[PDB]
Amino acid sequence: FELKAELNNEKKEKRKEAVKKVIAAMTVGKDVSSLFPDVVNCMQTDNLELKKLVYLYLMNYAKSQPDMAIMAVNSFVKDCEDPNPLIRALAVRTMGCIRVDKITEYLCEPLRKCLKDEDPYVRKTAAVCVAKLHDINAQMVEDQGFLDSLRDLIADSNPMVVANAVAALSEISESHPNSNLLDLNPQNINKLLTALNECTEWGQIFILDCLSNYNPKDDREAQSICERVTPRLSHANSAVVLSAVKVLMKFLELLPKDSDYYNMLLKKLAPPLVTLLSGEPEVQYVALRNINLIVQKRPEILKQEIKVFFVKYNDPIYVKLEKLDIMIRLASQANIAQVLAELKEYATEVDVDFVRKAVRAIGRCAIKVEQSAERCVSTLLDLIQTKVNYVVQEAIVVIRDIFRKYPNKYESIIATLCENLDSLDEPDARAAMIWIVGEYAERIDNADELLESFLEGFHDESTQVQLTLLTAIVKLFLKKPSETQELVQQVLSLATQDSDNPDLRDRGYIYWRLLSTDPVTAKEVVLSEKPLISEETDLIEPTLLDELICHIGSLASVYHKPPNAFV
Amino acid sequence: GMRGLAVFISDIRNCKSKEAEIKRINKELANIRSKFKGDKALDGYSKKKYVCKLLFIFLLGHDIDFGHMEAVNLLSSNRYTEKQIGYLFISVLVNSNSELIRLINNAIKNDLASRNPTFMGLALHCIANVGSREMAEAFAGEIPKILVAGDTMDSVKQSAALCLLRLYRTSPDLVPMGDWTSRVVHLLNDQHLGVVTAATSLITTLAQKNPEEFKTSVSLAVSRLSRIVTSASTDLQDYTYYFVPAPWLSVKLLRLLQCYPPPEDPAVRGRLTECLETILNKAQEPPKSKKVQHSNAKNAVLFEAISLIIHHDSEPNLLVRACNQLGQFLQHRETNLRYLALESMCTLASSEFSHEAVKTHIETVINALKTERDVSVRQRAVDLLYAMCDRSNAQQIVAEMLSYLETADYSIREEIVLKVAILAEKYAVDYTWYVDTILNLIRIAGDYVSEEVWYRVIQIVINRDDVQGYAAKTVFEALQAPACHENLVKVGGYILGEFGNLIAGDPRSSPLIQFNLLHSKFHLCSVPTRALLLSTYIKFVNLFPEVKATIQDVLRSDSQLKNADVELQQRAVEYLRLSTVASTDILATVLEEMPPFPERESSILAKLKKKKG
């Protein structure tokens, strides 16, 4: 109760002190909701600092209640006419900050006068307030007039106001009634580029964000935009550079073999992009993700820059992992020795998933080329002999992949793999080992016992392992018909009688209706030779990658997921 | 006071990072090497100081694996502080040894044969605090004669009763049931009400494990309860907690009475009814004190009485009064009271005599769900809503759970979706509503739904036949919407591939359009979804000769044939070779009507049962 007593003061200075005490009490968690009318009464003053403090209080509290805050419209209208522009902008911003259904009717008329005046800061604040309005309860019919006012408000000589107006338009353009933004014709594009030249870093970023939605009619416009965007290599590190890289990569629709500007453009992309690996660790991580996507899209850019992506000892774990795959992306015939030496060096570290991904990278380098395949198979044998469990599982998955890549070349290792089978727990390793056993069942006379051992618990297990086991058993039967009736009958009965998955039941039936129809067709279909796989190494599906090229800057690239997968 | 411990705390508590305290522990190790390893150690003060210092070091968060044999040497002492330090140190740290443990047993055996309450109390506290194999084998049948065959102080009696509780809990095998139960159940009416508390706890545990052994306690228990509930407002002021007469004692007596069936003697149950109406009437009056603790104690004893009434399930008037009290409590200002009332009504909802009375509070339950905006309270509300679910409400109750799913943070989403799935499956008469509800669940939550719910939905759609046409339709008009979650893709692929012949009649849903929509969904999905869509593609090849060429053109590209995953490659090769042969006989023979699923397990119920606890 003493809060009210100490707040109800007649001196203006002690009223200000009570105001900051109330702000501090709200910050620490105290509740002064019963003192709101007193603060409203004390609002009627002319002190700037008290004006800001009371406006902060008004936002923080009246955001929860519109009822008694309705009467504040008259005070806001009185405030938005005070000659000085600073408090005008503050008042209009705090007035727009209340998101209620009864404020739009009272703000539709007074807000019009704010968008048309001779002041850059006030115009910027008004544009931001219009963007604030359009978020909620602003579709109307006159709101089209407001958006037209914002749109032709682009015709300003101040970079800040035009930059924020363009950002607001880009954000509000999410609505798509088949009518896309109505604007950014070539003259507006030229004006936007001139502003980009004359803007600040933040509006530069906003303009580069918005500009990535135009479709050039001809190459000359694309050429002009390309040489008008290139000088964008600033001290803003990741933001401006990545936005320029995004817009350039989108504007590579001209023919690859044209006059020698395509090659020079590709040459331009390398220095500033590799420069990004010298900033803060988080922007380094973002740049590494973006470079991974770019290399996966266009691999003839970072061709001879492998040396920089060498993993350092002081780097954090996520940076280490992303530098590792970039390294594997850029490994080729010329850099085999040093890459494999580095991979062997990382293989002895203590961090778990880093060592897993390092041995996977060793195997993937093996997948890429043949001499690396032989040497990396030797290193995989050594790592298997090291007996470490997770390394063994990763090596088994890699060995399955290599067997798929190279047919009938590394048969001598299957006995060693079958020797250590009890150390498998993860579903991927079990599936890989089961497929290896099933495919090379002619060489192994002990495959029956292994598959029967995996057949003990058919339930309480991942569906992928069940499918792999079932297809391996069917393959083994079709290769050893004379003594494998019990296994196939049991596995088919388990699939089609107790499995809850309609996927597994479907596979059980699709094989059951084949093994009893025609053995010639069973041999021809199931055991049909499978073509080579031709450098499948950790690629993203091309449609997803192409859709992700349009979103280089955003979190879509960082998360490696489409924007529709998370709102 | 002791200066050493105070200096220790004041100095080492306010120091720098871990290296400083590590170096100070090293210095302490040097000091103990200097002194304990050899020399001549004093008896009382030095040993007390270093033992308490090492105990404090252990409590700080460090580990000590030595220095207790000379500490257990301290057990045989005359002064109380030394003995307490020794017992506390041997209780806090437990070691695996044979000679030292036997020395501990000899010392405690010598100590137990004392003639003062304090030493026996400390010995019993040490026995009950830890418990061990040697203590169990040596202190099994000799504690009862301290309890039964002895007129000693009350403190040692309570300690011995709780020691019997602990030993029976940890080693029931070697505790006999001999001729000692006569007085232990008889002392339930003893004075000082503390021996009463200990005996009530012990007998309650024993009856919870061995009910028929102590059936005679009912009469004394009900007599004590009747005396306690209404004797006087100023009687035994020592055991009155804020004007409430013995809350904990009454709670424990009510718990003891709950483990037994209603008494055969009509007089005993008559007294029970009398004291129950007495408790309810006493709770009816406005509080005698404005303090919240008085209300908390009164509501505690009232809730225990209500739980006993629910367990008995024999008095209709008592049940009606309890339900009225719960309905009054549903709008109580205190949050704890509302939460406890919700839990108690969820427990009570299983009673058939008050099922309609529980159902009459559905509007208040819905308002509480929509108003308080808590997490535990709203989980209790949805549990009670599930509890009161006879058919009678199915549409409204399912809609309310759907809304609460629409506003549900992280994991209550999963619990709600499982509960809604099982409830809709169990209480649906027109299964078209069930399919619509399932699609609503998939659309609303999507990311956090299940892995078994869509299994069950596919099983229902396949099994029930007649509803398959509407299911296939609604799925088709739901697929082409801009909002299409991943699980919806799988369910739609399976159902539509299986039953496209029912929808092929409409020109708006030509098979070419269905295949194009499925392929448009194909390029952005995980591996299992792509496998399901490939199976649907081959089923279309069986069912739709018109689109045979286009499909065969689809799964022949190098993206879907040279893929990086084993399963997709195998499925593509198999289906492509089946379509290439196309004998028109084998392919039609293979993919048959696929008879409906049998009622195997109803895995949703098992999953939700396992999720509990």
């Binding site: - | 304090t118 506290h125 309570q158 709780l162 602990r166």
Partner: protein
């Protein structure tokens, strides 16, 4: 029954621990950390009966200490809530002033009080008067 009794501070340090059945070395630390995470997030306008996995704890807020009592599902919440209130009160008129520094200084007194009112997982004595009289009786010697 009463599973464990804790007095956590704002940071997470355990000024009083008491476990009524066997727990491992890492298990105690994991339990303390998860109890702290559960307790510190809730605010004043929340229930005092929060449950995790197979348990439910009864927590109160006194000065800068979080008195946490873990009990079984079937035990009465309000009785144990008033029990922890009574325990805090007995510490109040015992030391005449409750503070974390005093608890650290006289941890053996805290253990003897807890053993006086709690043993084998149940409630031993409920009255303040007899506990105070007995505890001050042994203070002279």
């Amino acid at each position: 029954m009463i599973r464990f009794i804790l007095i956590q501070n704002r940071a997470g340090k355990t000024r009083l621990a008491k476990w009524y059945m066997q727990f491992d070395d890492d298990e105690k630390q994991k339990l303390i950390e998860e109890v702290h995470a559960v307790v510190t997030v809730r605010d004043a306008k929340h229930t005092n009966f929060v449950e995790f996995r197979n348990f439910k704890i009864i927590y109160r807020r006194y000065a800068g200490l979080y008195f946490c009592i873990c009990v079984d599902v079937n035990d009465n919440n309000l009785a144990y809530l008033e029990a922890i209130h009574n325990f805090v009160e007995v510490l109040n008129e015992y030391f005449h002033n409750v503070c974390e520094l005093d608890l650290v200084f006289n941890f053996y007194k805290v253990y003897t009080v807890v053993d006086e009112m709690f043993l084998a997982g149940e409630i031993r004595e409920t009255s303040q008067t007899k506990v105070l009289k007995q505890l001050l009786m042994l203070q002279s010697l």
